[PDB]
Design a protein around this ligand. Structure first.
Ligand code: ANP
Ligand code: ANP
Ligand code: MG
Ligand code: MG
Lengths: 466, 479, 159, 94, 128, 466, 128
């Protein structure tokens, strides 16, 4: 049956049907248009009229324009032929490499795994990053979130994690660009074709790319995540493999939701967001998961608007994570990269029965001395360090070498650090710190532990300083 | 006739409710009686909401409304150079009609992933601090953020004025057409701006889109987009452009007025949920095309005004989370005499390195480091030698206004500070030394500068000679 | 907060509780500097009753002023005159606490009930300087000023 | 951040600020930095150092107050803005 | 059911904050005006209504019970925020955990300073 | 055309016109009232009904009461005969000196000069007041933020400026009392009469008064700044003069704006102001600049909310300022008049390319010597002003001569001060301080520079006092 | 009445704060448009017209006067709050009272540094 547009406001389009009303989520195709314009049915307004959301610009639409009911949600290609390709919200290829001939197609909307499909296996995923490896190890099959403010470190980190992890990965990965910088996809795409994780000739590619950058309208940015998500689900279930799913900024999925919620006729919730922020988010995050049928190690970059971690968006994101890496501008401004907050990043894997007592005991040693140094910062700012006991000065000193020894030069950032990248092993990181704590290096200067790999390179740099 | 026409049902709040126009397209330009123009924003069952591009007090209930049958677009082309127009493209410099023969929608979506390539061509601002510590690349976006009266607008003007040395060349691949959008500023400043540009002989390769404090919100809301389309013209046709949205901070509060007026739910700092999309879509249009798409580009230096240096504010962080770097201008540095007041330690150029000339890379590569060591330590012969370099290099990055340097002269002046031919000199003089040293090299050494301008590199041959030129100058320098 | 701020004028006597005070284990956690009463007039309670009350409140306000000064300096800079008031503030502060019959299950002590006159005397004497030889703890959680001395004694013998 | 808390730290640091400036003068007239520090670990000076110490301490507090107050107003503006949006959402929900 | 059959049940409402969240979302889409931080007018009644059901019945009613340990989440440690104070001013006390005590090594990060039980002694065996 | 009041809700009134509908901003005249009640159009609600904001009480109005469309917006008397007279919001004389017999009339709502009508030259409006002209020059056609509460010389500096500009520039002046207190409004009137600026006898008056009392509704208080603006415009576009516009409390204009906005039911923006804040400030502020014909410079008194410079009101106002004259009690006490702070008052135009390199280096030298002397204060008092090197003893001295030379006797003070006021030309001030800085006048006593005019009167005053 | 008949009257409006509170209630109950602190947009116009009504009439009108003394209850001393702001401006001066000065002993509790009459010495005989 034929539906007709009866109203258009930005990205919300009301379509009235005279016969056969399209159910919610059903994807309607707008007629009379140059490129495919999909509307997603969001609600039944009554009077045979449905309110939808456009997956692309709605410029040019005219009331009375015909809209077709595809009879199903937004279905995208899933399968091995997606690998090495770049697709948009609605699964159309955008890498100028022609149709994506997959057998199966998949709806980008699906129910999350049931409670009986849940996995309880915890097994660390060492990353080579001392701060993450140490204080809040990532977990294979786990949900890693990387919170960070504008320009703090999310991207570079996700990139390093793709370097230090993805490459040494035996399986398929899915990178979902959501509301970020298009030239970044550009960067990523060409960095992958280089390293070879993407192959344009032989069919050996291992990465599937879904993109809906900050140039896209709210409806897209609001669903791209589900698309990348859906492409990851195929690899997990319909193939039972270990799937890596990177998503640079899932916060954009929520932000986008707010733009359209406005137009949908919803009274706004706290801070202007939509009422459905929590649920909307749940029905998505819950699909990003490991089941008994397969695994998904997801790494999600999370933007903190106005650097406010209490903002409904990020706030609401923590409960969905198995591991959190909180980046701080204050730390970044002291030139500590990655600007990871030693005292606000967590991992369900930070358990002695899981990473050992030596690992756990050092981790807590570090979060204790830094915590104790942090509580002294009040006194240091007013009365300097001449008003601290002899004991205090000692911790302050070890904290400062620990803080710096937490930094690390990543390959993906060599241009800004002016140092060759470093990949530190786990034992080496445990060791390095056990030592700084035990006072073993209380004779070396702070600046010696800054921007270095293992502890050994902390010493080398010390001699050079003489 | 209600298929291509309509009467105004109501006019108030800034949005005009039109009856009819059964055939209008969303985002379509429409014309009122008074000649004023609008855009179809909201298509509803019984009416059409029209954003009015101008004084909406001139619209009255009953007024006839007509379809132009077109999605909002604006004149585009080389004929716009040396001209001053309003958001809609209407010339406003008295100089008469525009010889424009092409048009382009202001809302065109930006290039996708495929057609791009990492910036790689220099976007020489002529500004020492910038072109050495925060190197911009053609096709990149570099936010210019700082408080009121910090020097933001200069960073940009000196940049436009710098291009002249290129456009008066022969090779179209090194020229840089410029576009300066004026949003929310005072007419006088614009007036004072082009007049300045004229004197520097810059306006000929410059377009100036203006939507000042007197212009209705929508106009200001729009301006940046129109200037972009014009910039895109050069981009997509193999040419290079540089558009300056002099503070989007004001395009944001202008949008906020329409949002709050259209009753869209207030969020952080009362802004709408889309104040980010507003800036992300616009700025995504600035880019560096690869050879299979013309190889041209569009560099955008947007400006953001912070409140008391609070870069964590809502808008400031949005744009920051869009652009490829920020040039932080500190108020304290300004009133302290450091001009340009570029807080180096905070500023960045996430993509300008590859684009930086090999010339700078050499000297400036070591300078970012020496300023690193200095920023840290700021007795003992070790650190004493670091503080000495620091206060000298710092005075080097000091620069005047309206006088952009040439990339080769920079490496020359910088070359001094890095190798150490300033250690023994005293601070208070380093600037007096500069003006003297630079005017000296320019005059008595066009060759060396020319070989560097031409090799974009300070070869071992150019280096040895540049060492001479500096050593045998210190001698004849009058403290 | 609107709710409470609108409720004040409806009262002829207000007793304000303070987390800060309760936190210093002082009960009832009544704020001495924020609890007021309409009859707190010398011509209704007499001059003796009034003066002591304001005398309490004042020394307690002075003590707040020294809280800061000593917050950076330490207890060894105040002239023997000031450090003297600090030492009385503490005692007067502590003597305002009182075990409640209803709060036995909490404190574990025997609730006491003080007659008015014994209260004034009690604070009249402490402000006088009389009990500057007794330890503060002696005044914490007691009835009339006597138990203080008594407790103070039970305190001397135990040491 | 909370207006109640910021207001608490500002007052508290404005106080400290006053007391430290006063000590700098007394010292001037006559904690003393790392003076007692050095000799133990191993007047003119003593007062010198005390002058210096309180001085810096005085600045360090003012630079701190100067930063709290900005946070004060930012946060002051935010609370008003919040209270208002709440007030209107209810009205526009009627 | 247990509390009404001479048996004792211990209930844990793992996160009334989220519960408050969902409640708000529902109310918003039922078109009832929003309020403080956008929650419904009766968010207080949302929890006070649930927690009172916890109780110690007398012997005439079986003498059973239902004890609750509702868990509340704060942001930036603000026990002084809407919901948080809503519940606090309901339950018979509260156990407060803090991130500060957590890293110092104090696990469980229970800050005695703010943690009280309005039952106190009434709920402890002789020896302990 | 005649309308009929169909809706009155406080200062808001909706009128229905059956045939001809009055455009927005068009003044309507209420029929059947003792005084004149003007309703300024604001919106076209539809159904031949228009909404408006009353310029005076609305008590007595009845639904159906007749209303007349005045054909255009609020028009007021313009021209010479307005000077010395006190005008109401709508143009009515309120000084009871009868009618304001003018042949001309103008609308309070006029678009700002077009881009071509713009001046591109940066000229400095000489006030003859040393500190002003030397440390914070008044941009001709620029706005200057007058900072300082009351009892600091405000009313005296305002009139003096009126005098000087008249004597040395032929231009008149207008005073827009936005949200003035009837009390101070009265005080100012007579204080001006006894000062000469206003003459109730011979047409020698140099200023036109326009008032917007607090008891007047937000509608009224919002338009006054424009009424007074329209008055000043006549003298710029009709007599080619370089007028001077005084807006005492530009803030109360802003606030006046928000109240209108709210009354009209618009959704407030951040901090409760009107969405239109910047435009309300734009449309008006922009009518103040240099045109080919002449120019209008305006001194607007500013109120910083909660002492917060970032609050919307001021921050929206600082976008339009070129200078700030800061009055200080600290200065007023020392007996220094005008009590203009030489270090807090500033100018954008204080640039070499604008005020000349010469003028620049002088203003700068004075700013730096004061800065140097202001620091010394500590040492001088504590460490004793006995161990001051040669370079340290001259600074303090010279600075004091400068500091006092910054004082100037106003011609409008003659009435009480018993001292001939002085009007110093820019030339004399530059050289005056230029020399003091050199040391040419170090062999003179301080009081020699206190309360004088050109540098000459400094030496002449020195010998007499020996 | 006295102001118009050569006589002089001093009027005290005990807390206009409360009056404003009442005006708002009516405003919001009629559904006018709410603004800062939910007060109607003309709340300022409410106090301005009342406060101006006070005046020192001219000998021609009798010489009578109506002196006003409105009271404003601040919260935690926030004078930068809506109504306090309002009135502060509308009136000619301020006599600031404070608790600290109170329990300190300074009674009446007036802050000589913060309180200010713009009329100053005008109404202060030379003796004073
Ligand atoms: N590991 C790192 N080493 C050195 N510099 C870093 C590192 N991480 C971040 N930075 C710096 O911060 C800048 C940008 O960080 P980036 O990875 O883009 O942040 P982001 O989290 O993605 N922010 P955004 O996308 O704008 O919200 C880089 O240009 C660097 O200067
Ligand atoms: N490189 C420079 N050297 C010296 N003075 C400078 C320089 N750049 C700017 N200025 C001065 O600073 C003033 C204004 O700077 P401007 O370019 O407008 O800064 P802005 O950040 O854009 N502020 P604004 O546009 O007024 O909000 C000018 O009047 C110049 O005198
Ligand atoms: Mg990123
Ligand atoms: Mg600028």
């Amino acid at each position: 049956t034929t539906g007709r547009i009866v109203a258009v406001i930005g990205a919300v389009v009301d379509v009235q049907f005279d016969e056969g009303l399209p159910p919610i989520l059903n994807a309607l195709e707008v007629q009379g248009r140059e490129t495919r314009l999909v509307l997603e049915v969001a609600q039944h307004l009554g009077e045979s009229t449905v309110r939808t959301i456009a997956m692309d610009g709605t410029e040019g639409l005219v009331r009375g324009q015909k809209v077709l009911d595809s009879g199903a949600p937004i279905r995208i290609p899933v399968g091995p032929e997606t690998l090495g390709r770049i697709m948009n919200v609605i699964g159309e290829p955008i890498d100028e490499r022609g149709p994506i001939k997959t057998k199966q197609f998949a709806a980008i909307h699906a129910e999350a795994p049931e409670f009986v499909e849940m996995s309880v296996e915890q097994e660390i995923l060492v990353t080579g990053i001392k701060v993450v490896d140490l204080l809040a190890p990532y977990a294979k099959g786990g949900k890693i979130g990387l919170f960070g403010g504008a320009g703090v470190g999310k991207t570079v980190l996700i990139m390093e994690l793709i370097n230090n992890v993805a490459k040494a990965h035996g399986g398929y990965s899915v990178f979902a660009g959501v509301g970020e910088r298009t030239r970044e996809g550009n960067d990523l795409y060409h960095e992958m074709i280089e390293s070879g994780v993407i192959n344009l000739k032989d069919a050996t590619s291992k990465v599937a790319l879904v993109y809906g950058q900050m140039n896209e309208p709210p409806g897209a940015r609001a669903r791209v995540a589900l698309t990348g998500l859906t492409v990851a689900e195929y690899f997990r279930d319909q193939e039972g493999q270990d799937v890596l799913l990177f998503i640079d900024n899932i916060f954009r999925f929520t932000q986008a939701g707010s733009e359209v919620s406005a137009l949908l006729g919803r009274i706004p919730s706290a801070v202007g967001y939509q009422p459905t922020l929590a649920t909307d988010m749940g029905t998505m995050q819950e699909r990003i998961t490991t089941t008994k049928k397969g695994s998904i190690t997801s790494v999600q970059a999370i933007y903190v608007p106005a650097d406010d971690l209490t903002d409904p968006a990020p706030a609401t994101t923590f409960a969905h994570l198995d591991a959190t890496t909180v980046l701080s501008r204050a730390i970044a401004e002291l030139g500590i990269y990655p600007a990871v907050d030693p005292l606000d990043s967590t991992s369900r894997i930070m358990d002695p029965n899981i990473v050992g007592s030596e690992h756990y005991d050092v981790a807590r040693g570090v979060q204790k001395i830094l915590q104790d140094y942090k509580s002294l910062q009040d006194i240091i700012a007013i009365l300097g360090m001449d008003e601290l006991s002899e004991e205090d000065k000692l911790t302050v000193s070890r904290a400062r070498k620990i803080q710096r020894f937490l930094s690390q030069p990543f390959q993906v950032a060599e241009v800004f650090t002016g140092h060759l990248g470093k990949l530190v092993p786990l034992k080496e990181t445990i060791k390095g710190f056990q030592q700084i704590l035990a006072g073993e290096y209380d004779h070396l200067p702070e600046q010696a532990f800054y921007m270095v790999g293992p502890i050994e390179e902390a010493v080398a740099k010390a001699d050079k300083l003489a | 006739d209600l298929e291509e026409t309509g009467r105004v049902l109501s006019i108030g709040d800034g949005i005009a409710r039109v009856h009819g126009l059964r055939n209008v397209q969303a985002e379509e330009m429409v014309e009122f009686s008074s000649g004023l123009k609008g855009m179809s924003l909201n298509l509803e069952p019984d009416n059409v909401g029209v954003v009015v591009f101008g004084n909406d007090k001139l619209i009255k209930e009953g007024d006839i409304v007509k379809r132009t049958g077109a999605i909002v677009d604006v004149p585009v082309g080389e004929e716009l150079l040396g001209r001053v127009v309003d958001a809609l493209g209407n010339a406003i410099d008295g100089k008469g009609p525009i010889g424009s023969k092409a048009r382009r929608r202001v809302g065109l979506k930006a290039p996708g992933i495929i057609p791009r390539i990492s910036v790689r061509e220099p976007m020489q601002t002529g500004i020492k601090a910038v072109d050495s510590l925060v190197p911009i690349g053609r096709g990149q976006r570099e936010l210019i953020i700082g408080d009121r009266q910090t020097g933001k607008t200069s960073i940009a003007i000196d940049t436009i004025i710098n291009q002249k040395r290129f456009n008066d060349g022969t090779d179209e691949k090194k020229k840089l057409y410029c576009i300066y959008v004026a949003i929310g500023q005072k007419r006088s400043t614009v007036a004072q701006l082009v007049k300045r540009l004229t004197d520097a002989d810059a306006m000929k390769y410059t377009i100036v889109v203006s939507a000042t404090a007197s212009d209705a919100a929508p106009l200001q809301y729009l301006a940046p987009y129109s200037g972009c389309s014009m910039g895109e013209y050069f981009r997509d046709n193999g040419k290079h452009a540089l558009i300056i949205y002099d503070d989007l901070s004001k395009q944001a509060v202008a949008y906020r007025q329409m949002s709050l007026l259209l009753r869209r739910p207030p969020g952080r700092e009362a802004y709408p949920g889309d104040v980010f999309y507003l800036h992300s879509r616009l700025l995504e249009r600035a880019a560096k095309m690869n050879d299979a798409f013309g190889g041209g580009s569009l560099t955008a230096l947007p400006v953001i005004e912070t409140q008391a240096g609070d870069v964590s504010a809502y808008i400031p962080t949005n744009v920051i989370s869009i652009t490829d770097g920020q040039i932080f201008l500190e108020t304290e540095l300004f009133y302290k005499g450091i001009r340009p007041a570029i807080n180096v330690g905070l500023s960045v150029s996430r993509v300008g390195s590859a684009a930086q000339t090999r010339a700078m890379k050499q000297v400036a590569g070591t300078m970012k480091l020496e300023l690193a060591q200095y920023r840290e330590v700021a007795l003992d012969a070790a650190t004493q030698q670091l503080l000495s370099r620091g206060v000298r290099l710092t005075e080097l990055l000091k620069q005047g206004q309206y006088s952009p340097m040439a990339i080769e002269e920079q490496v020359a002046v910088i070359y001094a500070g890095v190798r150490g031919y300033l250690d023994k000199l005293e601070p208070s003089k380093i600037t007096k030394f500069e003006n003297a040293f630079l005017s000296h090299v320019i005059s008595q050494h066009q060759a060396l500068l020319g070989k560097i301008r031409t090799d974009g590199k300070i070869s071992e041959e150019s280096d040895a000679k540049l060492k001479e030129i500096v050593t045998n100058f210190l001698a004849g320098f009058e403290a | 907060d609107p709710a409470p701020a609108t409720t004040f004028a409806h009262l002829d006597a207000t007793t304000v509780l303070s987390r800060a005070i309760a936190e210093l284990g002082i009960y009832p956690a009544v704020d001495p500097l924020d609890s007021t009463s309409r009859i707190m007039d010398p011509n209704i309670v007499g001059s003796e009753h009034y003066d002591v009350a304001r005398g309490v409140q004042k020394i307690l306000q002075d003590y707040k002023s020294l809280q800061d000064i000593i917050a950076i300096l330490g207890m060894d800079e105040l002239s023997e005159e000031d450090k003297l008031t600090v030492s009385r503030a503490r005692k007067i502060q502590r003597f305002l606490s009182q075990p409640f019959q209803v709060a036995e299950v909490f404190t574990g002590h025997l609730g006491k009930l003080v007659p008015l006159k014994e209260t004034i005397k009690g604070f009249q004497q402490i402000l006088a300087g009389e009990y500057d030889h007794l330890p503060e703890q002696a005044f914490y959680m007691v009835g009339p000023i006597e138990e203080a001395v008594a407790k103070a004694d039970k305190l001397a013998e135990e040491h | 951040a909370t207006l109640k808390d910021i207001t608490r730290r500002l007052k508290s640091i404005k106080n400290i600020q006053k007391i430290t400036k006063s000590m700098k003068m007394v010292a001037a007239a006559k904690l003393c930095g790392a003076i007692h520090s050095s000799v133990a670990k191993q007047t003119t000076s003593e007062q010198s150092a005390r002058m210096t110490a309180m001085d810096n301490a005085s600045k360090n507090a003012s630079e701190m107050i100067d930063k709290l107050t900005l946070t004060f107003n930012r946060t002051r503006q935010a609370v008003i803005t919040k209270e208002l949006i709440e007030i209107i959402s209810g009205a526009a929900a009627l």
